[PDB]
Amino acid sequence: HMPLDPRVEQFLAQMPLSLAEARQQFKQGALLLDQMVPPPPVDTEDGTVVTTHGPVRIRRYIPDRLRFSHPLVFYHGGGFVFGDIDTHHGLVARLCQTVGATVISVDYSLAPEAKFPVPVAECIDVARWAAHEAPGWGLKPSIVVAGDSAGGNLAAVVSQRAKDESLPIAAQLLFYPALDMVHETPSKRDFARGYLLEADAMQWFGEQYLRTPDDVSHPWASPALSPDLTGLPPALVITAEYDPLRDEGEAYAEALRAAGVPTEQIRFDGMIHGFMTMPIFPQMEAAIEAVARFLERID
Ligand SMILES: O=[N+]([O-])c1ccc(O)cc1
Ligand SMILES: O=[N+]([O-])c1ccc(O)cc1
């Protein structure tokens, strides 16, 4: 369908290890993008949450002007293997300042050192911590969960587990999430080479994160498999046109909508996976404005 965005096209055309080296390479790429398009200044405070699987470092972002009445809890992407609070600073800083929201960015345990479902547990525990702390920040105790890619998987799973875990969640923001590790979709078949997120990489991420191949069918790995989506938190689902994960994201949004979940589904045309941590693309800021607009309607 639609042409590639021009800046995206140029980026792809200009594109060209041990685990430690690969993690460093990912961090170096994130730094370079931040150097090209610097993040907004923002007040932050570091801390550590005691979870059921150990200490999890967090960073709380405080907006210049607080305008949104729920804390956001943000889970970074990176295939469950890469990324951290610093790689996703450019996005989180902008979410904080544009929405005018307190944001808790989470440094959950990475694979393969920690395996499925450890980060899911951690992410629930941090969300619960935030809900407990919210009144002392002058906020409502119901949280908004958010994440990109693998982080969007975590946000979606936390949301599905929330009622069972007595966790109050007001909304879920899924940025090009991974949701279905079982089924091939047309986008996954057709866009899995040459658009930054590759088939070989996704297979390797699964090998690092999952305990055994059978885990693909577990709903905490593949939340799109869950048959009952009724009563789940209001959902914003942002996809990229030329992303292998596009179709599972959009299908999940359709399923949420049909289950009576208030859902906004936005495809950014001509875009690729990862664009909301790539500030060289104006669509990153457009999508952050979509977040602000969506969250305005929650209260
Ligand atoms: O393991 N997986 O299926 C994944 C996980 C993350 C991602 O960005 C793509 C695929
Ligand atoms: O690490 N593992 O056990 C795996 C995980 C996923 C897969 O598709 C095959 C093997």
| Residue 137 within any structural domain of the chain | yes
| Residue 25 within any structural domain of the chain | no
Q: Which residue has its alpha carbon closest to ligand 2 atom 10?
A: 213
Tokens of 165: 């875990």
Q: How far apart are alpha carbons 78 and 83 in whole angstroms?
A: 5
DSSP string, 112-151: TTS-TTHHHHHHHHHHHHHHHHGGGGTS-S-EEEEEETHH
Shortest-distance atom of ligand 2 to CA 203: 8
3-state class percentages of the chain: helix first, strand second, coil last, to nearest 5? 40, 20, 40
**CB 178 near ligand 1, within 6 Å:** yes
Range of the domain at 170: 6-12+45-296
Q: What is the CATH number of the domain that holds 93?
A: 3.40.50.1820
- What 3-state DSSP class applies to 16? coil
| Residue 106 within any structural domain of the chain | yes
Q: How many helices (H) and strands (E) does the chain have?
A: 9, 8
* Short-list 40, 41, 17, CA closest to 27: 17
Contacts of 25 (CB under 8 A, 6+ apart): 17
Active site residues: 149
Give me the resolution in angstroms, 1 decimal. 1.5
Q: Which ligand is nearest to the CA of 214?
A: 2
* Long-range CB contact pairs, 24-27, < 8 A, 24+: 26/78, 26/82, 26/83, 26/87, 27/84, 27/86, 27/87
In total, how many domains does the chain have? Answer: 1
| Residue 26 within any structural domain of the chain | no
- Burial class from Cβ neighbours inside 10 Å (0-12, 13-18, 19+) for residue 27 reads middle
End-to-end CA separation in angstroms for the chain? 37
**CB 181 near ligand 1, within 6 Å:** yes
Per the CB < 8 A criterion, the answer to whether 59 and 85 are in contact is: yes
Query: Which helix H or strand E contains 236, and what residues bound it?
Result: strand 235-242
Per the CB < 8 A criterion, the answer to whether 59 and 73 are in contact is: no
